[PDB]
């Protein structure tokens, strides 16, 4: 699926509806980013700029101006067309084509921004600006406001009020529209296909990075060129490191491998974690830990619905975890006391869920301890895990095991929809998939 | 192959040999780089820092101190070990293990650098520093020198001389050792295997990005996780854009596809360009242009040897090109006059060769117009191309054709060695490879 | 006179009354200012900080916090007491004595500001800050707001709205209270005594700087240690330069001398300009120009009252000037046409009046072309002048004459009060004063 | 006296003689300095810029270029002439008049510096620059060097070596020429006349600031418009504060007053301190302390000569002081032991002598503990003092006494010349001067 021209227009209007009359909002593009010397990384647009434009160039600024409650318009500053610069570095939109292509009322050259921006802000009461996001942007904005402040003999006046639009825009981004959900739904299918493929390709003697290669190839072939985050392939003890990205080790028969990977499809992030045996067959010790993480996931997927919270569901996961670990002799004592002492924290030291969207760790207010009441349109990860350190004082057979299982969901009117359920997570289904692949 | 501990030691000593007595050289690691919000790009070490250390962490500084012509030592500042930071973001070397692992005499915590660096620079005459490379580094160095300048009542004195070490270090990097050549030799084999695979997989109806996926998968499977630059797959008119990286178009029967891709293997860059027909069979018009570019490459490979220059060989390429284009009726006039008017420039607008090493566009002085005399150990690309614009005033059949063929070579005592010859470039060999693959 | 503790309290409350509930206002002290190497200029407090505190130290910040419409409090950050720093650089207020001495509720050490300010701003809706006034202040404020923005897991939130308090505070400063007027009244008496003394001391053969010395001595002896601006003593052609401060020339018999000087008394600026003959007797040519400037001043002093404007009175001055210059043959043509062509501008190129207070060119909105309606409590200068360049194409006898006469006034319920009338300006009174002095 | 055109030329040549061939030295003018809002302090040129030019404008840069051991030239960047800017803010030198007036070979507009400076530095080996002195200067220099570094395709190269010229220039400034000594000699006469006048004007009931006024008036009348530092008038307990500049107290019969003041004459600083009784008659307790400080001064003036050091003479002063304080019962114990314990430090906590020149605390290397061997042409202060705190545990009659007596001297071939001896310091001579004045 994709995001339509009309959707980008609706988003801008939704922002304008919330702005004060006599105001302007400034949204700046991301700068290009050096990898080494003269070579740059693949360009990644600022998520907020992208949200309002679907425009993937640097040196661009969107200005939305609200004159009053019925009148408003949009100006884009963007790179000029240039034959020499384009024969080298590829095509640019320019000013002539921008109004039509992007649905803005006016487009100006980014090279003229210091001569034009103060003219757009003159006499307004409020400017909405994300201060400290990018240094180049603060320079441009502070420079416009200084001209206006010092220009009273030329009948210029500066807006005295500056408001951060991020709280407002992040609240919009927190609730996904049907179009956004269709995109994320496809991101989830793509990400799942990559995880199925890694399970099917994994053999003892392959390196962790080989599975990374299979995953990226699968993303690419469905049109997701880049991952939404650095892929994690942690076999054995490397699975106890939460963001292990070295992916440098030989995968050994007897070990588990934890794969945490997600594609970026039309800007939107998938995020799946699967843990599975390198040799296609879980040991008893591995099943004992795996079943605790899986029950935590399956219970969470049953509970998440409008009217509950991440905090409330986390409480139920903690109970499942402490209960399971007491039965294995990994924790000792009374379950209720151990829960009150947060005795699970050495083994499960991260949150259960985070928002998901244009960023893998998405924007939006969580509330104290993630107590915010869930409502339809919210998209989140559910990612329980247990990590037993190599030197943990526990029975030998559980030391050095890291297991995480993560699904992505959207809250619906009556419950949730699982966007990532097309990759298996039940241990018998994992084993059948790997056996079937090893034949073929 | 790889670079040994002993090689990194030799490089540091070679730098120290050139330093003044009573001096210190400061080499700073690259900062981490944001992709979007809280997520970062895969870390890429500064090439000069990497050259002297093979150490792939941020927040690190190498200080080499020459007391006199027989005494010198090395201090490393680097991140401290930290259980919580490592359970999350993975393992760190720390101070205890650094002296041995990296062959430095002393290692200190990067968090103490502002309390320790001025003590290392006190009373020295010269400091070697790459000013303006990184802002965080200039802050650290200017801050140390200000303490010393203002500390005469505490018997501190600053070095009055600051020298840029980049000219010296870039002259070292320009001449590759046998170990470096073995690494680059393998980078070339890997890069060639990726290009062969793309030729074998290409079918009409695939998208440009699908070939990018095949290439990256092939890099990865030989241990080159990342490309050395953003892969270019330009089919049809997209081949006229020199650094086209959108790779967004459907590849059409009848078109050529230009693939410019290179792996990064142990820090070193491969760089190959191949142009070939999407449908596996060159048309007459396509052969006519291709043969000019190929003769330019083959002649260049014959000529490059110690004692000549990039400028001298470029002169011979220009002659081949203008001569070929006059025979096709793309240029009109006398060949010698057209050469004197630089009449090839609309069609061939970049250099023939650049240095190659830890950076794809490597460091090293070229001399005026690239007239520097070539010597053994220099590694370069040879990359002739012809690009006829869609709207060029030339016979219709040549409009919208972009063809580049690039090989990587090292200058040897008697000539050169071609590091990338294991991927085919003769048109009949390309066609046979694609036919063989289409059967299967 | 002086400004009472109670007055500073009323001003702070007047600011708080205008603030939104759930907000804080930050007012930063001026930094110390280098004259040369290690030596500094006499400290001059920021006018806005001074206005609210009467506290003459650097490294101080006033924070006014409005919790709601009935509750608010004040925190001062200021330098800690320190025996060694004080034996050297003199006494400091410290934290213990500040609440009582300055009438603030709490005082904290300036050295702890980065650890305490974000705690004061946490959870507020609005912060009032003069952005771009001082760089050290912006660093402190941006740093507090970044901690809050990134501290949601610690239950911190930043105020999303930032408002410039300068418009509000400058509107307060524009209207002087009775206490302020008593201070300015004394500043005017002191400044007048200095100008009388310069007229009485002036002899041919003295240097311009000698009169500067007499003026500064007179300021000092009444308790005004510093001038409010760099004293101007322009004799002859130097009087045509509006802010001549070289004061380097020998004063010649036959020349006029223009003295523009003003004391700073309790922070408040006097500003008087007088022009008079070096030899104590005006020539006919000098009287002809002087009488035009004097009529402009005397008429202005009659007209200024509530309900008129600087623009309206300037119109009447322009008429007097153009009329006078036509009678001398300095302008040729019809008076109404010459007025419409602004034909006075080569000879009178500055404004008639500016606001006066804690700054000589004081804060406050003038309106387009200085059209703002005057109201009681406004304090302004009235400073007509005529400057005929040495090379002006006018009758020889008027070339190189610069004449300015400036008085300071406060608008009252029925008219104005002249704060500077105790120094003579009528030519016969000037001459009598100088004759009497020469006997002384 | 004054400094000649020829002297400024000799200084520049002396710097050039020490520069490497193929180099340039950049000396930047001081920026203008805000006092309050739009008003600025009296301009004070950078001492090093002034030393080489005698040019008192901002926005100026001197570039001295040494091509080789016999060829060199000077370029000045300075403000362009501008009729409007000059009618307002006074006259400028401009480019046409600069070569002749200042003895430079070429003059360019400061507004073109970013377009011209890199052209002057292109292809040089060394640049001499005082890094971190002024931020605007570092911006200009870093910007020129970045253009050159990145301009190799345009055949530009940057100098790789940057050397701080301050050590060299400060060593030149440390040794005064005969012309400089004649200027300082007159600065000393002027400063002495001011101190004599303050002694003659002082009466009980005057404020400390009134004596400041008398002193500044006396400076001004001899052509020293500004003090070289903020005048100190500390009566009573205020004399125990080393840099007391509040000068706010009523001078009381029975108290001493310590006056520390110095004029700035042609850029050069006088610096005299005198202590004397407000009522013109020393008490016994006051004489007891005064005689110790005076013996310290008189002995120092006998000892200072080529071949000794500030450290060596300080040792003799410490002995005189500890010996005197033991006789008064202010210190108890054996003199040699008390000296070894540095028992004088509570009462005499600053150095005896500092260099004096264009800065009151002048440039030049002192050596460890000020052990540098004195040579002819060095100019220094000799300023012993004793400060007994109000709460010191000593006999009551000595509490709250601060006494400093300071003279300025130049080292000569056989001894020293006292530049400030024309103001009295013997107590009977002080008393006779004050009695004579009271009759006024
Ligand atoms: Mg195990
Ligand atoms: Mg065609
Ligand atoms: Mg005349
Ligand atoms: Mg006493
Ligand atoms: Na996640
Ligand atoms: Na290349
Ligand atoms: Na004025
Ligand atoms: Na002194």
Swiss-Prot record, chains A, B, C, D:
Listed GO biological process terms: protein homotetramerization; proteolysis
Main localization, broad class: cytoplasm
SMART domains, per the entry: AMP_N (SM01011)
Matching InterPro entries: Aminopep_P_N, Creatin/AminoP/Spt16_N, Creatinase/aminopeptidase-like, Pept_M24, Pept_M24_MAP, Peptidase_M24B_aminopep-P_CS, X-Pro_dipept-like
Keyword Transmembrane helix: no
Enzyme class: hydrolase
Annotated Gene Ontology cellular component terms: cytosol; protein-containing complex
Residues annotated as binding Mn(2+) 2: 260, 271, 406
EC number: 3.4.11.9
Reaction it catalyzes: Release of any N-terminal amino acid, including proline, that is linked to proline, even from a dipeptide or tripeptide
Binding site for Mn(2+) 1: 271, 354, 383, 406
Compartments where located: Cytoplasm
Note accompanying the cofactor annotation: Binds 2 manganese ions per subunit.
Family matches, as PROSITE patterns: PROLINE_PEPTIDASE (PS00491)
Any one GO molecular-function label of the UniProt entry: metalloaminopeptidase activity
Keyword Hydrolase found: yes
Cofactor(s) listed in the protein's UniProt record: Mn(2+)
Protein keywords: Aminopeptidase, Cytoplasm, Hydrolase, Manganese, Metal-binding, Metalloprotease, Protease
PANTHER family: XAA-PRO AMINOPEPTIDASE 3
Subunit structure, as described in the record: Homotetramer.
Protein family membership: Belongs to the peptidase M24B family.
Protein name, entry field: Xaa-Pro aminopeptidase
Lineage of the organism: Bacteria, Pseudomonadati, Pseudomonadota, Gammaproteobacteria, Enterobacterales
Gene: pepP
